[PDB]
Every structure is written in structure tokens, then in C-alpha cells.
Enzyme design. Structure first.
Site, PDB file in Angstrom:
ATOM      1  N   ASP A  59       2.264   2.647   7.767  1.00 38.94           N
ATOM      2  CA  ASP A  59       1.017   1.807   7.499  1.00 38.94           C
ATOM      3  C   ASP A  59       1.299   0.406   6.933  1.00 38.94           C
ATOM      4  OD1 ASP A  59      -1.664   1.539   7.261  1.00 38.94           O
ATOM      5  OD2 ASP A  59      -1.940   2.196   5.308  1.00 38.94           O
ATOM      6  N   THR A  77      -4.534   0.171  -2.684  1.00 40.99           N
ATOM      7  CA  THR A  77      -5.431   1.296  -2.665  1.00 40.99           C
ATOM      8  C   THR A  77      -5.264   1.387  -4.409  1.00 40.99           C
ATOM      9  OG1 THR A  77      -4.670   2.589  -1.124  1.00 40.99           O
ATOM     10  CG2 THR A  77      -5.153   3.931  -2.785  1.00 40.99           C
ATOM     11  N   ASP A 116       0.959  -1.136  -0.114  1.00 37.70           N
ATOM     12  CA  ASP A 116       0.086  -0.071  -0.032  1.00 37.70           C
ATOM     13  C   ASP A 116       1.062   1.315  -0.194  1.00 37.70           C
ATOM     14  OD1 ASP A 116      -2.320   1.187  -0.114  1.00 37.70           O
ATOM     15  OD2 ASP A 116      -2.940   1.295   2.006  1.00 37.70           O
TER      16      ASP A 116
END
Ligand code: ADN
Ligand code: CL
Length: 284
Positions: A148, A170, A130
Site C-alpha cells: 500500500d 489511518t 500508512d
């Protein structure tokens, strides 16, 4: 073992769907931290326990200057607390939006930091999955702090694992192999890198639409274009990263790793050693 009363909490730094990040000072040391706080009832009810466990496990392995550091975890009856390094200057995305387009020196410097960070992560057998400007924070000195890790993957050295099967990411940055083969690999992060370099120069990521499905359709067709002015060596680099075959991306294991990527002409002037001690160029 730390407890909530060991800290004075200040402003909220951000909110996720299942977390709140609060600035805090530890009373006994006066150190500042960004503390990510998760409500246990919520993570349990919404089946998020594996992602919280993953975030702790992955971050516990990292000790490189270009990552947010996990210093401690603790819990009370209601909440889980992750004590993280505080990235005072926030998200890289903020700077892209406000300036519009990084100059070549700034593009090169920040790209080089991201490459160095990915080299470290991939050398530990970890896929981020991500990577995107919202997840590249900036410390007080304007060095990157990647974060993250709840959707990251530790590939097993015992089985020489190369592919990961969870569907995470994403849409703007997701790799074609995850969409079409239903698995990601280390090289999937190099696809995201290509999207990020493009975004730093062009102002927007290359595959962009108002609906995720429309983006997926463009990704799998490699449907994107360069704006007429785009630094030529950076365009060449992007074209060597945004390659549908994940085994043909510059930096991937099948292309013999980070040496050839760091040797790309876009990086001719980079001093790779001690990059985290160099003064970043001012973003204007
Ligand atoms: N270590 C951190 N330091 C500063 N801000 C953070 C940190 N971690 C998360 N945030 C902010 O909180 C949001 C939610 O995680 C992030 O998108 C970011 O803006
Ligand atoms: Cl934005």
C-alpha cells in the site's frame, strides 16, 4: 508488454474503494501474481491519478524481501493493471484478531522484520505514512510483505527534504505531528510501529475509539495505558516510540537512526542478518 489475455484470473483477493486485487497465473510462465486492477474512468473522475502514479513510482524503487514487489504494469482501454507478488497468507491483522495476542517470541520476530523493512525504506528516503497491520501481508513462508504505497512519499534528496505535507494515513496509527503541525516525517512511521507493537501484545492499538476525532484527541495528549501484563522490555520500547516529539523517537534521524533501535534490549536475541531466511516462529 503484457496484456490481460496473457493471464488466467482466479479468485478475488480483495477490494479497495478504487481497486480490485485478483489472483492470476501468467500463461507463458505459469507464475502466480496478485494483480491490482483499477478502472481508469473511476480513478480519473475521483481525482486518484496522483495516488496510482505514486504507487507505481514508489514500488518501482523497492527490492527488499519484506515488501510486496511490483513486477509489471500494463493498461488496456478501460483498466490499469499492477502485477504484484502474491502474499498467500494475507493480512497480519487476521492473525492478531484470531489469536488475540502474540507471545514474546512472535512479537519480537515480527517487530524485527518491520524494523528491518523500515530501515530499508527510510534509507531510501521514503515515508510509508500508512503503516498498519492491514498493510503488512504475509507470504507463504510467513515472512512480512509490506504493501500500500499509494500514500507513501519519496523525500527529495536534492532539497534534503525531511517533511511531507499531504494529509494521508489511518486514524489509529496517524502521528501527532501530522495532526498538529500538518506534516509527516520518517519518524511518523516509528510512531505507527509503536502502535503496532502495542497491538501485537495487547490485542488492540493504543488509541482507539468509535470516532476518528476521539482518537485524534487521545493521540495529541498521549492518552493511553498498558495492560497489567505486557512484556516489560516491549513496554519500554513502545514508550520510546510513542513520544510526541518526533525528534525523540528511538530510530529517528535525530536519535542517530536504526542502530540504536536495533540495540534495544527487546531485540537482544535477534540475528538481524538474513532475517528473511530464518524460519518464523509459529503463531499460536
Ligand atoms: N500482493 C497481495 N497479495 C495478496 N493479497 C493482497 C495483495 N495486495 C492486496 N491484497 C489483498 O487485497 C486487499 C485490497 O488491496 C488487501 O487489503 C489484501 O487483503
Ligand atoms: Cl480485525
Amino acid at each position: 508488454k503484457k496484456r490481460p489475455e496473457d493471464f488466467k484470473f482466479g479468485k478475488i483477493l480483495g477490494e479497495g474503494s478504487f481497486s480490485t486485487v485478483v489472483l492470476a497465473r501468467e500463461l507463458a510462465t505459469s507464475r502466480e501474481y496478485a494483480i491490482k486492477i483499477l478502472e481508469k474512468r473511476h480513478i480519473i473522475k475521483e481525482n486518484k491519478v496522483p495516488y496510482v502514479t505514486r504507487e507505481r513510482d514508489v514500488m518501482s524503487r523497492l527490492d527488499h524481501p519484506f515488501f510486496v514487489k511490483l513486477y509489471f504494469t500494463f493498461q488496456d482501454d478501460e483498466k490499469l493493471y499492477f502485477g504484484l507478488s502474491y502474499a498467500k497468507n494475507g493480512e497480519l491483522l487476521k492473525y492478531i484478531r484470531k489469536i488475540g495476542s502474540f507471545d514474546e517470541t512472535c512479537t519480537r520476530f515480527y517487530t524485527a522484520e518491520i524494523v528491518s523493512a523500515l530501515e530499508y525504506l527510510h534509507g531510501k528516503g521514503i515515508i510509508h505514512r500508512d503503516l498498519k497491520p492491514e498493510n503488512i501481508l504475509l507470504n507463504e513462508d510467513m515472512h512480512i510483505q509490506i504493501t500500500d504505497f499509494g500514500t507513501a512519499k519519496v523525500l527529495s534528496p536534492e532539497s534534503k527534504q525531511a517533511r511531507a505535507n499531504s494529509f494521508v494515513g489511518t486514524a489509529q496509527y496517524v502521528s501527532p505531528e501530522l495532526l498538529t503541525e500538518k506534516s509527516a516525517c520518517k519518524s511518523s512511521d516509528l510512531w505507527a510501529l509503536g502502535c503496532i507493537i502495542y497491538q501485537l501484545v495487547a490485542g488492540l492499538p493504543p488509541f482507539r475509539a468509535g470516532n476518528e476525532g476521539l482518537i485524534f484527541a487521545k493521540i495529541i495528549k498521549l492518552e493511553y495505558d498498558f495492560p497489567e501484563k505486557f512484556f516489560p522490555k516491549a513496554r519500554d520500547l513502545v514508550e520510546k516510540l510513542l513520544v510526541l516529539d518526533a525528534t525523540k523517537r528511538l530510530g529517528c534521524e535525530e536519535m542517530e537512526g536504526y542502530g540504536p533501535l536495533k540495540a534495544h534490549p527487546f531485540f537482544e536475541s535477534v540475528t538481524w542478518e538474513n532475517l528473511h531466511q530464518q524460519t518464523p516462529p509459529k503463531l499460536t
